[PDB]
């Protein structure tokens, strides 16, 4: 007389549709963050080589 | 003999501690009991906590767990696997099919337990044994290892 079952009104809705987020770094800006860093770093390496010389 | 007894007792204690703190069982899973055996090593029970890392080959493993039924065709393979292991060779008969007959125990192509071959040290009963049951069986095996006076016997002889 006490069968287990859903509560009066039913359970809450649930999502199952593979929610997609976006936590990626960037799209194109990483190319600049690499290239400008490369140029400035090579300049710094040149200055270091001059000091060592 | 009493003067040189403390040293041999300490050596026995050290060897027993070393052998109990790192057992490398070989997953010789055969049937549904292999599911529970790999399920013990999951994130909930963490079989690795006791230094129970598994091994892929019988050359390095010092223990093996016979999880699952043992048919007639796999009996020679089981014997060959057991032979290749190094000297200690502790064997655990997980499940109810491996530790004597089993739920079949009567069909033509079934070995009535893994005790006709590969002599067993610990019998773990269940179909399939609960993960805690396998953990208790491993603890019992560790307790068995602690009773080995390896150096005392070789020094008395």
């Amino acid at each position: 007389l006490l069968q287990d079952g859903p509560p009066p009104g039913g359970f809450a809705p649930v999502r199952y549709a593979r929610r997609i987020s976006n936590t990626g770094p960037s799209a194109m800006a990483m190319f600049l963050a690499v290239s400008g860093a490369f140029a400035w770093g090579m300049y710094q390496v040149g200055q270091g080589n001059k000091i060592r010389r | 003999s009493k003067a040189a007894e403390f040293v041999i007792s300490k050596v026995d204690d050290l060897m027993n501690w070393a052998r109990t703190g790192s057992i490398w069982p070989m997953t010789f899973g055969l049937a549904c009991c292999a599911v529970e055996m790999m399920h013990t090593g999951a994130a909930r029970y963490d079989l690795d906590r006791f230094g129970i890392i598994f091994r892929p080959s019988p050359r390095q493993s010092d223990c093996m767990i016979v999880a699952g039924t043992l048919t007639n065709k796999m009996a020679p393979a089981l014997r060959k696997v057991y032979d290749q292991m190094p000297e200690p060779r502790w064997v655990i008969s997980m499940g109810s099919c491996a530790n004597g007959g089993g739920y079949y125990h009567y069909s033509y192509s079934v070995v009535r337990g893994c005790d006709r071959i590969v002599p067993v040290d610990i019998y773990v009963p269940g179909c399939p044994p609960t993960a805690e049951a396998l953990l208790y069986g491993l603890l019992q095996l560790q307790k068995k290892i602690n009773r080995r006076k390896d150096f005392l016997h070789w020094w008395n002889k």
Binding site: - | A75, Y108, R112, I117, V118
Partner: protein, 185 residues
């Protein structure tokens, strides 16, 4: 596409002398042929447009140790696009070669060997017919009603020679057969 339509069609379309007998029931539609017009019947049922039976589910086997044709192999079929099931069966014999159907359905290659292994009904024009389930040195066919449940040979390890050797069966506790059969039924 349902049971009755297929029954009418295969009663009309099928050439005679192929189906020895047929049944129509809710359990399943049967086409019992005469162990020789099997390849032809399956080929017709596979290629015909109104009966596009494409997949062979399994090849069964029943041992009746009371009829002259002892064995009875059963071919379960299924038509995917018509969504219908046809169960064709024959009558075999312990010393007789029944034709194989590997050419039509390649999946039958292993059920063929399994039926050979369990019962002993050999087949013609089959590439292998090697034992697939029992031991390499196994003797006899186990699913026959003659074969004892415990079997004929046991397996154990003996120390005089370091290998696993077979031996005559000798059980500690015999299989207790409980005879629950009662009258009034």
């Amino acid at each position: 596409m349902d049971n009755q339509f297929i029954f009418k069609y295969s009663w009309e379309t099928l050439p005679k002398k192929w189906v020895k007998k047929m049944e129509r029931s809710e359990h399943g539609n049967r086409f019992d042929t005469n162990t020789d017009y099997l390849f032809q019947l399956l080929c017709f049922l596979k290629l015909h447009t109104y009966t596009r039976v494409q997949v062979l589910i399994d090849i069964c086997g029943v041992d009746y140790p009371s009829r002259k044709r002892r064995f009875e192999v059963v071919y379960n079929l299924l038509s995917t696009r018509y969504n219908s099931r046809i169960r064709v069966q024959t009558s075999a014999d312990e010393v007789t070669r029944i034709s194989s159907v590997v050419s039509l359905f390649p999946s039958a290659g292993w059920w063929e060997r399994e039926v050979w292994d369990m019962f002993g009904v050999s087949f013609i024009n089959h590439p292998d017919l090697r034992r697939i389930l029992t031991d390499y040195g196994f003797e006899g066919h186990p699913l026959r009603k003659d074969f004892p449940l415990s079997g004929y040979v046991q397996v154990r390890y003996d120390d005089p020679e370091k290998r696993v050797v077979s031996e005559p069966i000798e059980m500690t506790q015999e299989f207790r057969y409980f005879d629950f059969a009662s009258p009034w039924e």
